[PDB]
Design a binder for this molecule. Structure first.
Ligand SMILES: O=c1ccn([C@H]2C[C@H](O)[C@@H](COP(=O)(O)O)O2)c(=O)[nH]1
Ligand SMILES: O=c1ccn([C@H]2C[C@H](O)[C@@H](COP(=O)(O)O)O2)c(=O)[nH]1
Lengths: 316, 316
């Protein structure tokens, strides 16, 4: 089945992943260097052996495509995937005067009541960003996140480069170019960042009128991370193909440190006992072609029939 | 045998590589996305089914390590791998007053006498760079080449970052870091360059006291390119391991566009009829550990017994 490569990665890490301690002191089982491919002509690689929220995937991707860096957009779509990042700044600001939120991420993980005051402050923060424009401009803007890296790479000369916009043009004028590359890694910024890009670099490739894309992910959470990562980039591959009038080829996913956190083993084992169902089909707006001017309604997933979702503790 | 992955790549591209035209109008057979690994504890991956000049590999690598960008160093070691690049500038300079060298690369490929006047001017150019310090400073310096990218990444703030020097430190203080990454791709520079980095990015990884390195090569010449590329990075893996006091793991080589130029098929087929011999063993100076202060004498290849070399026309 289409998603089999993912299940095969989960197995391999269980069988031969060496224990390797990580920064979160949680513990992991990892392997270095792995690659899997998905034939996008066979279907959309959104897992069926477990329910994945495609809505969070499409919204976040469009957010990236717009060159947006402000969370406000996301909250407007109920997408909270990045809140933790903006909320941190607020908490550590001189304007922040409320309950000490030190190590709130896992502190909430170890306190039902702390998580109460914490989920309270968070709910407030999200409200301000949603309504108070000046507050949003100050705390809702992540700054250095995929959107600016893809669409507004700051140059020494003081300008900004639209990597993605330029590459799409190159695909339209030199499809056989061996350097349709977009980077998210900037040695200048990487040192001072909290979490340097996990999706370090990706490359397009065209042949026989088909578009393929290879992604280099330096670090990966097999259980919680990967199911999403696959959907984000397979979707990007479709959008760019659509915009360039090409057929879709395959999404090649290359890994650096693929890992399983020790606290996801029972969950991963369970999923492995499930049998993949046919993959869903993706459908994009035929009339509209400028992918940068796309919105939710322009992308629809069909025939997605997953198994129930699988809950598991995030490693914080 | 140790080099089997390479032979397996050659086969695969012959069997299922789709014809794909390239910028040199030569013609190629390519595949997108491939990965092979070499267990460095089993030997050094310098091909035995064909003779490869390790001297050119060690000198060029040290050149990179020194953060050097001036060809002068290379010529001092009889290494001419980069001449073509510096020679071009000279030819197109206002100080250059001699035979028109337009498209000299392949123009020489189609004229025994042009190649004569051309090899004459080149021999002169190399002499000036070797003796005339001022000329070298002007034409012998490539500027944006691996050495400066690895060891002196120019920042907007006006500084220069030593990626490699910093990463080696991180390996010594946080070996389990999932971001021991060095990039050679700069969106700001890539557009105006003649040949953007083929070796786009590489990543270190440590576990069980062993160092592994994964390389992302966006484009590759299976026949003339790869045999060298493998040696350069397997050697870098050894040097860094040596400097950090770790054992050696494996070199994982990831590819974007792996290709065979149409004019190398008879040669590749011939090599495929050869049977790999045991791999050579690498030996580094035990007393000296600061790899940036290394020189030829500090690295020796043992028991390398290849088959005769295989001549083939370079795609220019
Ligand atoms: O889309 C994402 C984002 C993050 N990660 C994971 C990788 C690691 O589990 C953690 C980042 O820790 P470091 O790799 O930076 O050390 O987040 C993913 O797999 N997918
Ligand atoms: O160390 C090297 C340097 C170059 N190439 C090859 C790849 C392509 O054959 C050509 C570069 O052409 P473009 O890929 O940039 O389009 O050089 C290699 O395989 N190895």
């Amino acid at each position: 089945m289409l998603e089999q490569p993912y299940l095969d990665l989960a197995k391999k890490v269980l069988d031969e992943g060496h224990f390797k301690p990580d920064r979160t002191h949680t513990g992991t089982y990892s392997i270095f260097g792995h690659q899997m491919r998905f034939d996008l002509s066979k279907g959309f690689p959104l897992l069926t052996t477990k329910k994945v929220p495609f809505g969070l995937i499409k919204s976040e991707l469009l957010w990236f495509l717009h060159g947006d860096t402000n969370i406000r957009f996301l909250l407007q779509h109920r997408n909270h995937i990045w809140d933790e990042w903006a909320f941190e700044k607020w908490v550590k600001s001189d304007e922040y005067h409320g309950p000490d939120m030190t190590d709130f991420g896992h502190r909430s993980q170890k306190d039902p009541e702390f998580a109460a005051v914490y989920h309270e402050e968070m709910a407030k923060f999200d409200d301000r960003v949603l309504h108070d424009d000046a507050f949003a401009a100050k705390y809702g803007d992540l700054g250095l996140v995929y959107g600016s890296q893809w669409r507004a790479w700051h140059t020494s000369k003081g300008d900004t480069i639209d990597q993605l916009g330029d590459v799409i043009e190159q695909i339209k004028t030199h499809p056989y170019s061996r350097k349709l590359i977009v980077s998210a890694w900037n040695p200048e910024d990487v040192p001072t960042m909290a979490l340097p890009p996990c999706h370090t670099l990706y490359q397009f490739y065209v042949n026989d009128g088909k578009l393929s894309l290879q992604l280099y992910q330096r670090s990966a959470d097999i259980f919680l991370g990967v199911p999403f990562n696959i959907a984000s980039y397979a979707l990007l591959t479709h959008l760019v193909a659509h915009e360039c009038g090409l057929e879709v080829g395959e999404f090649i996913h290359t890994f650096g440190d693929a890992h399983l956190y020790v606290n996801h083993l029972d969950q991963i084992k369970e999923q492995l006992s499930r049998t993949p169902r046919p993959a869903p089909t993706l459908q994009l707006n035929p009339d509209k072609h400028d992918i940068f001017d796309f919105d939710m309604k322009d992308i629809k997933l069909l025939n997605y029939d997953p198994y129930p979702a699988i809950k598991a503790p995030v490693a914080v």
